[PDB]
Amino acid sequence: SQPVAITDGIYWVGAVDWNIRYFHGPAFSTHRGTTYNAYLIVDDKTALVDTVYEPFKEELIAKLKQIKDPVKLDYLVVNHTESDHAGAFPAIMELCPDAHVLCTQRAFDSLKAHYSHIDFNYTIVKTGTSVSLGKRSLTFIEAPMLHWPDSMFTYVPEEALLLPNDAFGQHIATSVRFDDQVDAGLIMDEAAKYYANILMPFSNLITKKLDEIQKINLAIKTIAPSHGIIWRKDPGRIIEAYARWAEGQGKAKAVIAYDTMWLSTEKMAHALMDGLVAGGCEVKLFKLSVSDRNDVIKEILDARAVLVGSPTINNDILPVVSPLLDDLVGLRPKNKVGLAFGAYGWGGGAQKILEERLKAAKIELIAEPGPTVQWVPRGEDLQRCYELGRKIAARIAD
Amino acid sequence: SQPVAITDGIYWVGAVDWNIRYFHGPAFSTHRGTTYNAYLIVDDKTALVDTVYEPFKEELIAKLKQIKDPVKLDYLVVNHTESDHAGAFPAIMELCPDAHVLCTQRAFDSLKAHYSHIDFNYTIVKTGTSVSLGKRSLTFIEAPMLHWPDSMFTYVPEEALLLPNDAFGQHIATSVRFDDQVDAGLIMDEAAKYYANILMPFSNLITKKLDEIQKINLAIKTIAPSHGIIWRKDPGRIIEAYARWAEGQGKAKAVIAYDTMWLSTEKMAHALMDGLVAGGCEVKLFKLSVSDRNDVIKEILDARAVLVGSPTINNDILPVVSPLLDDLVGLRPKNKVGLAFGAYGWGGGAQKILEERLKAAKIELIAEPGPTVQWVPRGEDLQRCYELGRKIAARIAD
Numbered sequence: 001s002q003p004v005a006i007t008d009g010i011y012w013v014g015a016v017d018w019n020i021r022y023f024h025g026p027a028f029s030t031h032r033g034t035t036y037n038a039y040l041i042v043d044d045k046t047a048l049v050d051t052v053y054e055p056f057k058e059e060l061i062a063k064l065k066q067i068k069d070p071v072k073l074d075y076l077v078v079n080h081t082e083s084d085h086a087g088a089f090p091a092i093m094e095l096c097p098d099a100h101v102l103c104t105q106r107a108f109d110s111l112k113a114h115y116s117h118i119d120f121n122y123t124i125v126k127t128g129t130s131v132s133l134g135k136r137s138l139t140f141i142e143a144p145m146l147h148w149p150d151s152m153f154t155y156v157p158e159e160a161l162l163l164p165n166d167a168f169g170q171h172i173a174t175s176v177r178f179d180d181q182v183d184a185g186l187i188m189d190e191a192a193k194y195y196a197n198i199l200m201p202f203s204n205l206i207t208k209k210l211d212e213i214q215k216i217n218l219a220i221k222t223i224a225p226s227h228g229i230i231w232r233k234d235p236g237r238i239i240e241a242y243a244r245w246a247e248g249q250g251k252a253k254a255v256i257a258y259d260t261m262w263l264s265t266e267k268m269a270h271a272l273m274d275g276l277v278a279g280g281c282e283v284k285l286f287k288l289s290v291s292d293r294n295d296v297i298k299e300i301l302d303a304r305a306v307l308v309g310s311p312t313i314n315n316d317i318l319p320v321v322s323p324l325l326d327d328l329v330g331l332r333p334k335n336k337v338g339l340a341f342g343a344y345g346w347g348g349g350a351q352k353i354l355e356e357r358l359k360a361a362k363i364e365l366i367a368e369p370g371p372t373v374q375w376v377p378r379g380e381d382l383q384r385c386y387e388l389g390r391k392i393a394a395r396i397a398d
Numbered sequence: 399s400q401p402v403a404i405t406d407g408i409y410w411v412g413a414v415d416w417n418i419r420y421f422h423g424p425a426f427s428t429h430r431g432t433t434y435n436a437y438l439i440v441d442d443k444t445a446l447v448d449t450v451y452e453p454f455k456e457e458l459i460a461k462l463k464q465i466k467d468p469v470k471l472d473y474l475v476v477n478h479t480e481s482d483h484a485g486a487f488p489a490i491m492e493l494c495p496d497a498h499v500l501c502t503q504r505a506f507d508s509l510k511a512h513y514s515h516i517d518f519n520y521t522i523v524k525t526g527t528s529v530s531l532g533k534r535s536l537t538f539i540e541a542p543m544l545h546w547p548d549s550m551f552t553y554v555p556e557e558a559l560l561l562p563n564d565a566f567g568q569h570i571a572t573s574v575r576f577d578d579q580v581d582a583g584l585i586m587d588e589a590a591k592y593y594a595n596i597l598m599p600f601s602n603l604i605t606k607k608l609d610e611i612q613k614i615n616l617a618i619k620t621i622a623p624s625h626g627i628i629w630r631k632d633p634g635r636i637i638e639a640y641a642r643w644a645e646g647q648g649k650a651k652a653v654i655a656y657d658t659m660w661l662s663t664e665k666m667a668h669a670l671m672d673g674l675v676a677g678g679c680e681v682k683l684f685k686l687s688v689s690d691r692n693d694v695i696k697e698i699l700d701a702r703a704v705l706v707g708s709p710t711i712n713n714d715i716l717p718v719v720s721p722l723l724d725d726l727v728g729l730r731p732k733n734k735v736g737l738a739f740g741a742y743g744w745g746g747g748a749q750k751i752l753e754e755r756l757k758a759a760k761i762e763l764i765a766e767p768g769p770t771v772q773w774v775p776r777g778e779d780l781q782r783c784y785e786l787g788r789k790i791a792a793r794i795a796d
């Protein structure tokens with residue numbers, strides 16, 4: 001209800017969403033809700049950075065009024081136009097028709113598309129352009145595909161404050177606002193779940209952007225994303241993390257996701273696992289119909305190996321295994337080795353589909369024609385899987 | 399606990415599984431449990447038809463012993479070798495090592511695969527072979543792929559009793575055993591849920607099989623499946639139902655399955671629905687992340703149109719929509735018209751995938767390049783969808 005000062009004249013005026021359990025419709029599971037972060041920079045001219053998810057506009061406005069009532073607003077920065085950040089645009093614009101919009105070109109197009117019927121003053125910004133607010137100013141950095149084509153970060157020189165919008169955020173609801181008021185390991189895990197499910201496909205763009213920021217030698221003292229905690233005590237940690245994740249070196253870990261109807265594919269999953277562990281490798285095993293897809297993807301970000309298994313039903317794979325596969329193809333895991341496996345009763349069919357989809361995700365099969373078994377595994381069948389797991393372990397070496 | 403007599407000398411000795419909520423691993427959802435039906439025919443020689451899911455072997459044996467304790471068993475018929483019916487094979491075979499197995503060739507192969515280490519006396523049966531038990535006898539009818547390659551039905555002429563194993567069954571748990579002690583509409587619906595998710599792919603085989611039985615002019619006075627209620631009062635209904643479902647004529651109904659992240663695909667689903675309803679069509683609308691895939695498939699059995707929609711995320715379809723698509727390809731719905739639709743932000747990509755998978759399920763698209771919208775629908779966009787729903791209605795005619 002109350003705004004929170006990041007420093008004098010700079011306030012967090014977002015909204016906390018405790019009860020939301022799924023983001024992007026079904027796409028992302030938020031076991032602990034999330035927040036919609038918006039920032040108010042007060043000066044000779046005052047600027048509001050991003051807005052809020054439409055259902056929380058009241059909270060935005062109520063917080064704005066707590067800093068200064070008749071909401072002033074000279075500039076309204078729109079770093080991103082998805083709905084969780086631009087949904088309260090009509091309301092804010094209605095509250096200050098004179099507000100000057102600062103956004104990218106693609107942003108401007110999106111904004112006219114999602115709202116039209118709303119006229120407003122503006123200026124398309126590009127990497128490097130800068131507006132002054134008086135004592136402080138805000139410069140911009142275009143971030144195409146650093147989630148969306150319209151994406152961009154805002155930087156406040158005078159304070160070394162970076163406002164990347166989605167980048168560096170984590171989906172978590174707390175009444176506390178800063179990284180130093182939260183458990184280090186828990187918040188870094190949320191951050192990884194975030195990266196893995198949203199930024200994984202743009203890993204190469206992340207390093208490029210990180211380097212650009214590195215060259216220009218930008219001083220970053222605090223990072224305020226659009227979701228979650230504000231990295232005020234140690235931005236370095238999250239920046240180093242993004243670099244490692246985007247590089248994709250990985251860790252000597254393997255994720256095995258699968259499902260079964262009568263346990264044979266499971267017995268194979270188990271043997272494969274034993275081989276992987278014997279080869280000195282950490283293993284995470286997921287029975288998909290009982291695990292969270294986003295929690296599985298998060299584990300894959302650091303894994304060097306991804307094994308997926310399934311029996312064949314009606315000459316296809318088991319439908320619970322589909323989500324993970326189409327999600328992998330779209331997320332484009334970088335630098336991963338893999339394997340498909342599973343049982344069958346007569347003709348088979350799921351193995352082709354599994355290898356097809358795994359290759360479409362650019363994951364290199366450690367073995368064209370993966371382990372397959374008819375009806376039930378026998379001693380040598382499980383032994384072969386064990387050896388295979390041992391092979392994968394040797395390659396994921398480290 | 400107690401066996402139930404179907405008629406003197408013929409008893410139901412199966413087990414009721416009240417708490418199972420998912421069958422075939424994740425594949426089939428059993429909102430109300432299921433049962434594993436097995437029958438004991440007593441005569442000069444006594445025969446047991448099918449056994450029971452391994453975890454319920456004690457109930458089987460306990461029931462057998464209440465009929466006659468030293469379990470006698472001269473013949474053990476194995477109509478089907480999946481585990482829900484042959485899981486207690488070891489235990490029965492160890493209780494009567496001399497039992498004579500009567501099964502198909504493919505059954506015999508499966509049996510040696512899933513068990514080996516168990517030898518038993520037997521005789522491969524074919525359509526027409528018949529064994530006598532004294533006063534009554536049992537004749538067999540091979541039923542390849544009427545679910546499994548090893549499937550077959552058992553017929554007891556003296557009583558006009560058909561024991562089809564899975565065919566004609568329904569996944570439902572009740573303490574009552576017969577169709578006349580259950581609501582007609584509820585049991586027929588469960589029967590349809592069953593047919594749609596298991597038998598839909600073999601609808602052509604179903605009519606052939608129904609015809610062969612028709613010509614041979616078999617007197618069926620009672621049908622005792624391997625799951626659910628026993629059709630003892632009106633076998634006709636369930637046989638006529640299978641005929642109509644297998645035929646695939648359908649009904650003037652349309653199923654629309656979809657999901658969205660921001661509501662545009664939903665608004666399109668809505669428009670398409672209005673057109674379909676305006677054209678005199680019944681419509682079932684399913685938001686996939688909140689509906690039961692099996693419940694959705696059941697509705698498609700009767701539908702003449704199947705519309706599937708999805709926005710595009712990372713150049714792919716939304717992962718929640720995958721299960722239904724791969725399940726439709728494998729189930730091969732007979733004689734269906736369809737359409738794919740959805741929104742997108744820039745490049746698109748889900749429409750291609752949707753149409754491909756829809757074709758792969760041999761569903762005739764009522765329009766290659768289905769309705770697609772960028773960002774949000776505008777008036778003409780929804781109008782167009784409305785017209786399309788209107789068009790499909792016209793074809794679904796009736």
Ligand SMILES: Cc1cc2nc3c(=O)[nH]c(=O)nc-3n(C[C@H](O)[C@H](O)[C@H](O)COP(=O)(O)O)c2cc1C
Pocket residue numbers: 259260261262263264265266310311312313314315316342343344345346347348349374375376422423480596
């Ligand atoms: C409804 C159902 C449909 C099936 N369809 C096929 C099929 O099309 N092709 C095949 O080769 N096996 C088929 N099977 C057999 C399974 O692939 C086989 O039983 C396997 O051992 C099960 O693997 P699991 O124990 O890992 O679940 C089917 C089994 C069931 C229950």
Ligand SMILES: Cc1cc2nc3c(=O)[nH]c(=O)nc-3n(C[C@H](O)[C@H](O)[C@H](O)COP(=O)(O)O)c2cc1C
Pocket residue numbers: 024082657658659660661662663664708709710711712713714741742743744745746747772773774
């Ligand atoms: C995480 C996320 C990833 C996206 N990826 C793509 C993409 O690869 N290609 C595209 O054309 N649009 C993409 N979009 C844009 C959506 O397709 C677009 O916003 C659409 O309007 C959402 O459909 P809906 O309102 O039915 O949920 C993406 C949107 C989000 C939120």
Ligand SMILES: [Zn+2]
Pocket residue numbers: 001
């Ligand atoms: Zn409040």
Ligand SMILES: [Zn+2]
Pocket residue numbers: 274
């Ligand atoms: Zn082990």
Ligand SMILES: [Zn+2]
Pocket residue numbers: 399
């Ligand atoms: Zn009991």
Ligand SMILES: [Zn+2]
Pocket residue numbers: 672
């Ligand atoms: Zn309406």
